[PDB]
Amino acid sequence: MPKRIVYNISSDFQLKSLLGEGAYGVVCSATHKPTGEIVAIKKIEPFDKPLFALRTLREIKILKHFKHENIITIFNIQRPDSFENFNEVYIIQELMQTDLHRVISTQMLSDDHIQYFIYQTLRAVKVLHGSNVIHRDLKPSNLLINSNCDLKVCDFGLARIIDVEFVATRWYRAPEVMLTSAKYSRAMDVWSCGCILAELFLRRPIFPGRDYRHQLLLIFGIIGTPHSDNDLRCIESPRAREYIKSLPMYPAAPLEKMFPRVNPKGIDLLQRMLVFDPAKRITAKEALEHPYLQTYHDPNDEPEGEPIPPSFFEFDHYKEALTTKDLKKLIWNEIFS
């Protein structure tokens, strides 16, 4: 295991392998010697910039709040030996064998698998939206998977509670988000679920833009260019409306012709997910009720969740921004509670 990876945690743990490395997080499997359990441990260095600490805090609070089969379970967070020596956060969780990006890229999935994977994703999304929480960073690599096909969502630091920063991967970003200054909505998460479903049918990203312009061009090339004022109602930013009117006038591409071998019911669900107007985009709940998922749909086993007030992320709303030290205390409270 990369000798450069160092975890300032109890010697009872024995790092096994590097599962993920990014500027925000580093994830490794590790063995808890005393019990023999193999766990996943996510290391974060939250205190060089408030932004990092806010994300850490939002991720930890969400993890601890949900107890749902499709939301990665958190076992515990390591307790530092002191406030002075508290420089990294180690979130200990249940170890999954891999993520959906790795799966879609290394495996031929049957229609059954696809149904089961998108079903579980929407099932986690439903309990989140029912709690007034939007993930905002839904993509294959943030969907953890096991051999038996169980799926769990992870990476909840960019979440927000309804009513300089880390940006979500443009390929999965809803068009109303790239255009207007759009207010966080449940629909943006569904749009990402649509790109994920499409990614499962195609085995590659459906909208891999180079940048902002290219992204919009790719999206409309498939869903059709919004043209009339009825279509443009959902867009506020006047600048944004003029940019849209400058695009080629694309009709909705005929998905079933382009991909004749995909279950027609699946294309139907996908099309309802990739709708321009966020108000006309299917909801997670309705998607679970779609015919394409009737094999796994169960109205009595689909947690709706319960409202979480905005004050849950109170720290995100200060006139005078919180200092690193303020957030360190807030994170500490979370760890020791």
């Binding site: 891999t98 698998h113 089961y116 998977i145 051999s147 096909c149």
Partner: peptide, 11 residues
Amino acid sequence: KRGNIPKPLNL
């Protein structure tokens, strides 16, 4: 599990 669960993967 809860019914017609898909075939397991080789991961």
